[PDB]
Symmetry: C2
């Protein structure tokens, strides 16, 4: 009865600690990577006026596109998951509120 409810509470609290560790890692990596991508943009913008470089630059930019598109999809899916969880939490807060009466 009380013991087993306490146990799911502990598991949920464990999951939050892992969520936060992963979130701290994701934010750090995203933060560092957008800075590096911003610097690479300036580098490309510079070399694209000089030597052009045929494909060596045109394909190298294309590669970065594909990685950016990849990340575009991951952030969209992360947004969509968090928004769903937010919605379900507000449903849960309402449901829990009304349990008592």
């Amino acid at each position: 009865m009380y013991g087993k409810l306490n146990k799911l509470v502990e598991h949920i609290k464990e999951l939050l600690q892992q969520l936060n560790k992963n979130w701290h890692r994701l934010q750090s990596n995203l933060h560092d990577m957008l800075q590096q991508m911003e610097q690479l943009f300036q580098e490309f913008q510079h070399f694209m006026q000089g030597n052009q470089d045929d494909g060596k630059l045109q394909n190298m930019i294309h590669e970065m596109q594909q990685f950016m598109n990849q990340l575009d999809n991951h952030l969209q899916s992360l947004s969509d998951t968090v928004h769903h969880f937010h919605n379900k939490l507000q449903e849960l807060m309402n449901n829990f509120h009304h349990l008592v009466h």
Copy 2:
């Protein structure tokens, strides 16, 4: 150094792929356990309406949920900021070609 800078980005993005998958898992798992915990409270509240012990645990979960909601909101706002910066970079990179 263009190759060094590019390869270093491919490094980050690999780690970034990995922390995205784990965070998705954590969010899925957490939402599922919270739903299952609600269904547990709902079941045990039908037997004993007035139980003070069970209501105290509900009240603690309400405090937990309110803190989680404010936290999820901060995740949303930060992810939106990153995604806007990313979409500015994509736009920028687009007009190189």
